[PDB]
Amino acid sequence: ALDDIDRILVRELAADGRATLSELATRAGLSVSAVQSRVRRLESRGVVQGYSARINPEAVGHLLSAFVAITPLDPSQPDDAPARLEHIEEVESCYSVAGEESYVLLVRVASARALEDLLQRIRTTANVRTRSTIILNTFYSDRQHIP
Amino acid sequence: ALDDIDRILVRELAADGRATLSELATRAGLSVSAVQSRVRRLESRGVVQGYSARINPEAVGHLLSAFVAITPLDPSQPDDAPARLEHIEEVESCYSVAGEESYVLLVRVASARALEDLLQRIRTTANVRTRSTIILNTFYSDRQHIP
Ligand SMILES: N[C@@H](Cc1c[nH]c[nH+]1)C(=O)O
Ligand SMILES: N[C@@H](Cc1c[nH]c[nH+]1)C(=O)O
Known part of the structure; x- marks a missing residue:
């Protein structure tokens, strides 16, 4: 698994890696509180592995x-x-x-x-x-x- | 045309694409404003094609x-x-x-x-x-x- 709010996060973070902790949560539908720790449980369990400029x-x-x-x-x-x-x-x-x-x-x-x-x-x-x-x-x- | 300083910024941005401008600045020895500017020139010449979560x-x-x-x-x-x-x-x-x-x-x-x-x-x-x-x-x- 990996719920379907975690998907909008990873979809969002793959097109825009600087994608801003706040801007995420509007189209993610949530609070800067919630987001910053999905985005962190997502790195812990190895789902986003790093951020890179191309x-x-x-x-x-x-x-x-x-x-x-x-x-x-x-x-x-x-x-x-x-x-x-x-x-x-x-x-x-x-x-x-x-x-x-x-x-x-x-x-x-x-x-x-x-x-x-x-x-x-x-x-x-x-x-x-x-x-x-x-x-x-x-x-x-x-x-x-x-x- | 890519000077010593732009080299430092694309290496740091390669290893960490969520590098905040203040961490970039105190690493190239410039102001957070000189950093923003350079990062934007980098993006519009074509050196940085975007940013993604891996x-x-x-x-x-x-x-x-x-x-x-x-x-x-x-x-x-x-x-x-x-x-x-x-x-x-x-x-x-x-x-x-x-x-x-x-x-x-x-x-x-x-x-x-x-x-x-x-x-x-x-x-x-x-x-x-x-x-x-x-x-x-x-x-x-x-x-x-x-x-
Ligand atoms: N031709 C390759 C496969 C490949 C991947 N990229 C280019 N070629 C092989 O010998 O296994
Ligand atoms: N395949 C061609 C070059 C090519 C690229 N795209 C189409 N054709 C060659 O090796 O000479």
Whole structure:
């Protein structure tokens, strides 16, 4: 569960993360008292996990984004690739997947040449083959849907 | 054009999108008014595209997430898929991509049976073939990195 007043809160907070403790409660139909603690029981139980401004990556010098699909070389060692790559900072996301490959990483980087670098790093640090797919344009990116 | 100070503001706003302007100000060493101004310029050049709560998709009922790569049934028409798929709510992101396929979507849904239904709506509304890669587990996502 997660009641149906908690939904209007999460719908509201996903389109507007600065969305103002007061303004919420009008279209939420309630008191600033009630809201501030739903919004807090919602973070306790892990339902909203954080608040983030959406930074444009081109604008901050990330001119190439790639999905990078990786598979470990040696199935005899502990498969721990996510924890091994976790310190590499250009890896923005790391998913395990049912497909040809074990994990899919989304990765951001200064230039085509910088990707060649990040990939040699990804391979020597986890012990993986890489297969990568270059993003040409992001049309829209996390529109969260609350059913 | 992004100086040392704008760098500090988008990093803080990335880690905490509900950062109050006074916490931002006493962190860049400026007045709460210089901070407001800068945050507004940041928003209207295109560096900060908005603010969102990171909602946990399992908690609101999306127990299955998938990457679906889509390629045109006839590719001579200028390309359409993103616009026509914008109105499918369960499509969370849409990137065009170099290689054999044209766009990759990240999609989220209630179940196996529901994925099967979304694939139909996708094939039909964008007139596209689809290759699905089910996500088994997300280890970390959205870690935005400001260099
Ligand atoms: N083609 C990928 C799936 C994918 C996700 N994003 C891009 N591609 C795999 O090898 O598993
Ligand atoms: N799929 C094409 C590029 C493309 C993007 N959208 C449609 N087509 C390629 O890899 O060369």
